[PDB]
Design a protein around this ligand. Sequence first.
Ligand SMILES: [Mg+2]
Ligand SMILES: [Mg+2]
Lengths: 239, 264, 117
Amino acid sequence: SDQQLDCALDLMRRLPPQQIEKNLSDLIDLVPSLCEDLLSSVDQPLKIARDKGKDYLLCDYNRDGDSYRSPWSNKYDPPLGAMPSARLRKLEVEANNAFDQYRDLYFEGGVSSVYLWDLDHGFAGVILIKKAGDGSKKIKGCWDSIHVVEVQEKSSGRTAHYKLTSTVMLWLQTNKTGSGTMNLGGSLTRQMEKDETVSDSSPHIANIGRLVEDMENKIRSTLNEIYFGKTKDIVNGLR
Amino acid sequence: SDEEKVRIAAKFITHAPPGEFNEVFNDVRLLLNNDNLLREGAAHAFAQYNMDQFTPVKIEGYDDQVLITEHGDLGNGRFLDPRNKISFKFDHLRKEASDPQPESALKQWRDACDSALRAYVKDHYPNGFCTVYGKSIDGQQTIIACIESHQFQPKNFWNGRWRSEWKFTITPPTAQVAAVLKIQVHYYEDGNVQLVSHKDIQDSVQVSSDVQTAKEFIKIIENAENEYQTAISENYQTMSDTTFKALRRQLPVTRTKIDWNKIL
Amino acid sequence: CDKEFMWALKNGDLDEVKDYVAKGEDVNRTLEGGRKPLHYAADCGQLEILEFLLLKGADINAPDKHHITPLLSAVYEGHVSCVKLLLSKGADKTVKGPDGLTAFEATDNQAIKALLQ
Ligand SMILES: [Mg+2]
Ligand SMILES: [Mg+2]
């Protein structure tokens, strides 16, 4: 079914991007063979859970079984589990506290979550940021960003190699008198590969955050052009 | 289950982007893997997509393209071309027309509104098509104007389509107007983004003669579809400097990038 | 519930901003984000939201957690008509921002500099 999954992914790229949850569920009920292969390949909106006391975001890299581990309490909400090493868990808390400020400085709200896992010659992490514009009938929107970084140490540890892969899902809806209902939905994916020095004045998190910030500033610029420029010109070309 | 796999397959075909029906049909065919379940189960879905998208079709020897709409459905697999009073077979899969045959009470107003609408569509749309219907709905005389305009450029990785449906319910001396305008754009050159926009319109107009009411109908269509397009461009700008910023800013409030070792 | 009030302030949904304040909310309370309702409106150039918050009794000179006045916020983001209203309603243009500069010294906008004279 290698050509079956191809048509399944080609279908999700063409369907209305604000119905991925039900389409992917209908798509799995249609062909349950690729149930696991699709979920690990289809970009889905980030889901929110409660630590029970901040919110935290759910993904596959912080999941073990049918339970989800909180980045604050370090315990799975469905009690168990795969835990980070004591040295990595300490670096993970610094990462959550660093990207919690990054979330506030650039989004002024929303939820953020960082999860790390040890590989072999380094560690890899996921940065999850979720910003929703609720509480208004006329103006709505949401922003989901998923960053996966791979850190590779080089000998003495003065320089390391980083590999970044980011996806930003953007939705907007307006209900105005003149333009009626306008709905914009979609996403954008970028990859990165670079190495920077690792001194005491610039640790790993200072390098990872410096690459997430520059990436999201680049993605935002492209999103502003394809959302409010490219699609605008296509509309004016229809009339 | 096997009544549920065609229900899922029909829904996927219903929500195909303009100009991407063929690519969605293949993905659905290779996924369902039951070509006879797809042809008789999702037959209504192929007809539903074409009728909802106002698909223009070229009939041999009749030059003017006609839109496939629910108002043109004659209830026997055929569709009506009110301009050249004929009916024809339409194959919703190949999008082909065949078997033409000739095809009442509100015929003069339809001819008038059509003549006025064709010049309007030519003055405002590049590759635009239109079709005006005259019929009775629940004992009420109704005039239905439909407009379609699309640009299919898969080589440039984008497609778009404009749709307009204007319903004028004649109740002398008035006519209740109910309209819907629809735009759908898919752009996948870099990234992937889809626009879905609609607007509902309710208005009133006093009827007179078949000609004075026709030009008064087109006037309402012209003023409303001008405001719709202009307000969309003004809203695009608002979403650029405001609604997007309310999600994520370009720079922090301090207007300087983050000092990352001042956080740790 | 603080974020949804912040969302209405930024996008200028006057009806939602009106209900929140009518329900008994404080137009001068700093939201959890770190700014007062005047800041979020002036930061996004919401002239109609500023007029409502002002006649509802908001402090036109109160700073946020960035030490930025509502006048300075509109000046930083280049909202000309918002600077015009705030000055007409009595905003103190002599207050220095976190960089020690007044509004006149902190912008190269000639239109805004003309208003600040
Ligand atoms: Mg034009
Ligand atoms: Mg200067």
